[PDB]
Amino acid sequence: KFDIDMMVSLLRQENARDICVIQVPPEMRYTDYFVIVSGTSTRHLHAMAFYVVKMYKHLKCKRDPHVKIEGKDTDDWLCVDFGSMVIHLMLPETREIYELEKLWTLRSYDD
Amino acid sequence: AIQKMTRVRVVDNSALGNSPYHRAPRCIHVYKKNGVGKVGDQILLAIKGQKKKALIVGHCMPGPRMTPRFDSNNVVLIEDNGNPVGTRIKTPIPTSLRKREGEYSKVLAIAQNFV
Amino acid sequence: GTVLDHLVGEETMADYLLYTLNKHQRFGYVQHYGLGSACDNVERVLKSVAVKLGKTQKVKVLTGTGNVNIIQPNYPAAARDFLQTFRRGLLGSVMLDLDVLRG
Amino acid sequence: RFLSPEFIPRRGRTDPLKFQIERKDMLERRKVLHIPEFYVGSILRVTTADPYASGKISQFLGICIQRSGRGLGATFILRNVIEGQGVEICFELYNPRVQEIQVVKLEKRLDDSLLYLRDALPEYSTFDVNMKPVVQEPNQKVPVNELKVKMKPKPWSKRWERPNFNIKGIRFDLCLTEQQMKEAQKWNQPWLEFDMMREYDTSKIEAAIWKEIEASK
Amino acid sequence: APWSREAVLSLYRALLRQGRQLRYTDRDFYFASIRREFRKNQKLEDAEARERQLEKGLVFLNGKLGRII
Amino acid sequence: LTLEGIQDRVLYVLKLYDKIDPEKLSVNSHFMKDLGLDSLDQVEIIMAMEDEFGFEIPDIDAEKLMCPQEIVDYIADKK
Amino acid sequence: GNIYRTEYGLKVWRINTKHNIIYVNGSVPGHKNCLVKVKDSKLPAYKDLGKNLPFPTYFPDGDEEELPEDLYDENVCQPGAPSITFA
Ligand SMILES: [Mg+2]
Numbered sequence: 001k002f003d004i005d006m007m008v009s010l011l012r013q014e015n016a017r018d019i020c021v022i023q024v025p026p027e028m029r030y031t032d033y034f035v036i037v038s039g040t041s042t043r044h045l046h047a048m049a050f051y052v053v054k055m056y057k058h059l060k061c062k063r064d065p066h067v068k069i070e071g072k073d074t075d076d077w078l079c080v081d082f083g084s085m086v087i088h089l090m091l092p093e094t095r096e097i098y099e100l101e102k103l104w105t106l107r108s109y110d111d
Numbered sequence: 112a113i114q115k116m117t118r119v120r121v122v123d124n125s126a127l128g129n130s131p132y133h134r135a136p137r138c139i140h141v142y143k144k145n146g147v148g149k150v151g152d153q154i155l156l157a158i159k160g161q162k163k164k165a166l167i168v169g170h171c172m173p174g175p176r177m178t179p180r181f182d183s184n185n186v187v188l189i190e191d192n193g194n195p196v197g198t199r200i201k202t203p204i205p206t207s208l209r210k211r212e213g214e215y216s217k218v219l220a221i222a223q224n225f226v
Numbered sequence: 227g228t229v230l231d232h233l234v235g236e237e238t239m240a241d242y243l244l245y246t247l248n249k250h251q252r253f254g255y256v257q258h259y260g261l262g263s264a265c266d267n268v269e270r271v272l273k274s275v276a277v278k279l280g281k282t283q284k285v286k287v288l289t290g291t292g293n294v295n296i297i298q299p300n301y302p303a304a305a306r307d308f309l310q311t312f313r314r315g316l317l318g319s320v321m322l323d324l325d326v327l328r329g
Numbered sequence: 330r331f332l333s334p335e336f337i338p339r340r341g342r343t344d345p346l347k348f349q350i351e352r353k354d355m356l357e358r359r360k361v362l363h364i365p366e367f368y369v370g371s372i373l374r375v376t377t378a379d380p381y382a383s384g385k386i387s388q389f390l391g392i393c394i395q396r397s398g399r400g401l402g403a404t405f406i407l408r409n410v411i412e413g414q415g416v417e418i419c420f421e422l423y424n425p426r427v428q429e430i431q432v433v434k435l436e437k438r439l440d441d442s443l444l445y446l447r448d449a450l451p452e453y454s455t456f457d458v459n460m461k462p463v464v465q466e467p468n469q470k471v472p473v474n475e476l477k478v479k480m481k482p483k484p485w486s487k488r489w490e491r492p493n494f495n496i497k498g499i500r501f502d503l504c505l506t507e508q509q510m511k512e513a514q515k516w517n518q519p520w521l522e523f524d525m526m527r528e529y530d531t532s533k534i535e536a537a538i539w540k541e542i543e544a545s546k
Numbered sequence: 547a548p549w550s551r552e553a554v555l556s557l558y559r560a561l562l563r564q565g566r567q568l569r570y571t572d573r574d575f576y577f578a579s580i581r582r583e584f585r586k587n588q589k590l591e592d593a594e595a596r597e598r599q600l601e602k603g604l605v606f607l608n609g610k611l612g613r614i615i
Numbered sequence: 616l617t618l619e620g621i622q623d624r625v626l627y628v629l630k631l632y633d634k635i636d637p638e639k640l641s642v643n644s645h646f647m648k649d650l651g652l653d654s655l656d657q658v659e660i661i662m663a664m665e666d667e668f669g670f671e672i673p674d675i676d677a678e679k680l681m682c683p684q685e686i687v688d689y690i691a692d693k694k
Numbered sequence: 695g696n697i698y699r700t701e702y703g704l705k706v707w708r709i710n711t712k713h714n715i716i717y718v719n720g721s722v723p724g725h726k727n728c729l730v731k732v733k734d735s736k737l738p739a740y741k742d743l744g745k746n747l748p749f750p751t752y753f754p755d756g757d758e759e760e761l762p763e764d765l766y767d768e769n770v771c772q773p774g775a776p777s778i779t780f781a
Binding site: 551552554555556558559562566584585588 | 653654655657658661662666674678
Binding site for chain 4: 286289290292295
């Protein structure tokens with residue numbers, strides 16, 4: 001099953017410079033897990049999202065919907081939607097300007 | 112719905128969003144085969160003499176039943192590449208955006224509230 | 227004034243006087259329209275002249291609750307009257323080419 | 330006793346066997362969840378599952394401003410101006426994505442449709458989301474609070490000053506002037522309220538509906 | 547100057563004590579993100595902002611708006 | 616449990632720690648002016664200790680370490 | 695109006711055997727309480743699948759597995775089934 005534990009097996013395989021997985025409350029409604037990861041270049045991000053779809057296509061999940069990769073024309077942000085987690089790929093410069101880690105951990109106490 | 116030159120409001124923490132003086136952005140195009148724009152449709156937007164792409168998030172028009180019918184036509188700003196301009200969104204945003212086709216996972220990571 | 231003010235914008239032309247009357251050190255709009263001392267924000271300079279000329283406007287502002295009308299100082303009429311005094315010559319003799327005169 | 334509006338058939342040339350078949354599916358759904366007595370002035374907290382998320386529930390609180398829709402697809406619309414911004418959700422009553430509906434304050438306002446609260450001040454329509462339900466009394470009259478609102482200036486969404494709407498929930502006098510009181514009274518049309526065949530006399534029909542309700546238990 | 551001077555010391559130590567059991571999110575970036583939240587923002591500010599910033603981390607201690615796993 | 620085992624282990628993880636220096640690192644190092652430390656940076660000294668040795672260090676006794684002689688002497692009787 | 699028009703490819707979702715109801719998807723030409731002509735579909739994809747249907751007619755005198763009050767489809771919600779949870 002395509003769950004949270006093999007994300008650590010998959011992201012640390014390609015030497016991700018940053019991993020941030022957040023358990024969102026069940027009250028707040030987007031997903032179950034929120035994954036924010038960074039990269040070295042925009043090339044390293046683009047092949048990284050194109051391999052995390054490679055594991056899902058062979059692991060099965062027959063009845064589940066497919067996967068669309070959003071952001072194929074931009075370089076600073078790449079995001080992939082799934083049923084029980086949503087992964088988000090940025091650059092270390094883009095990490096700070098959006099401050100996306102503190103949004104889902106502090107819903108209304110931030111800048 | 113949102114045709115050409117409706118008045119909308121930008122719901123963003125942008126420096127371009129808190130406009131003084133003529134504080135009413137005017138759209139110039141909808142990116143559909145109709146003039147009609149619904150929840151999750153690209154539109155253009157003329158702000159301060161600058162034309163900018165935009166994304167409809169909720170309108171004043173009655174649509175389907177269990178979807179919110181917001182009393183202001185509020186619209187989030189994106190550039191051509193697809194990510195939003197701002198850093199935070201404080202207004203409520205409907206959760207009808209996830210299933211619909213488009214770069215909408217960029218928007219839902221910015222919303223503080225999901226009603 | 228070689229084009230109509232509509233296609234460019236009255237407030238768009240209004241900020242460009244503040245570029246050319248403050249960075250040229252030609253602060254010549256502060257004896258006819260002296261507001262407090264001098265300002266470089268287009269929001270503030272269209273405020274105080276609208277008080278001095280008595281300008282009122284009724285604008286549909288778009289807040290989240292609905293469409294309400296708020297009486298505001300008339301920012302286009304303040305942007306009009308600030309542009310006419312430039313063309314009459316009651317604001318100072320200015321060169322617009324100092325940006326290309328640098329060097 | 331309170332008979333809910335959707336069980337009353339609208340006047341029409343529809344065969345009564347259609348509404349008999351409708352009331353069977355109304356009453357089988359009511360076994361699943363309890364539908365309380367909620368009026369047009371009632372405040373409701375509705376929990377719904379939705380297919381947009383991964384299977385969570387959403388709790389939306391609001392004032393039940395308009396309770397039309399006459400059949401199995403009966404609707405009620407709630408209002409909140411939470412975080413300064415108006416939210417307007419039309420809840421279908423018999424849709425199987427609802428889990429439980431409860432009243433926070435069971436009360437009734439003077440008007441049968443509170444659609445004017447769009448043109449009212451937001452102070453008269455905001456509601457505390459985490460507020461506790463009020464303690465109910467078993468057998469007394471429902472509370473009618475004469476809380477006639479004040480409005481924003483004249484360009485409203487609809488012409489509520491006209492007597493065809495028959496709004497009795499506005500303090501009209503301090504926001505509207507006497508010459509355009511008189512001009513709105515030009516549309517008075519006094520013959521409607523004296524009329525007989527535009528009045529749908531529905532007293533006999535509730536006897537068959539209440540016969541159907543208690544025989545289902 | 548804050549609500550309590552010792553409460554700043556305790557809220558730093560408790561959030562790292564919640565952070566030693568981190569196993570999926572990287573422990574290396576977690577300690578640096580704790581520091582850059584506090585070295586930049588808790589040196590010199592106004593009066594009421596001191597009470598607000600410490601109460602910000604009390605909500606982050608409970609994890610009722612989201613926990614980092 | 617040797618006393619000199621405290622001397623070469625607690626100082627070792629401080630030697631890996633890069634904010635302090637060998638230049639002023641005596642046995643009676645002052646922490647405000649002979650080390651250059653902050654209020655929460657004193658906690659960072661403790662969290663350089665608690666991850667490797669301990670796991671029962673309280674809060675109020677972790678304030679008054681103040682010097683490298685006490686961190687050997689106080690935590691010797693902790694065992 | 696007042697001409698014979700046909701709508702094509704309308705699914706039956708449900709059947710009430712007691713009052714003889716056909717639950718037909720969408721709208722049918724004609725006003726309420728009007729007489730219609732109910733034929734199996736002409737659409738090529740929807741006209742070959744007729745194996746399980748009772749072929750001459752349906753005969754209630756066969757007395758084998760008497761049909762209930764209401765025959766359903768797979769996707770329909772039962773009135774009496776609880777609230778649907780998508781998780
Ligand atoms: Mg209006």
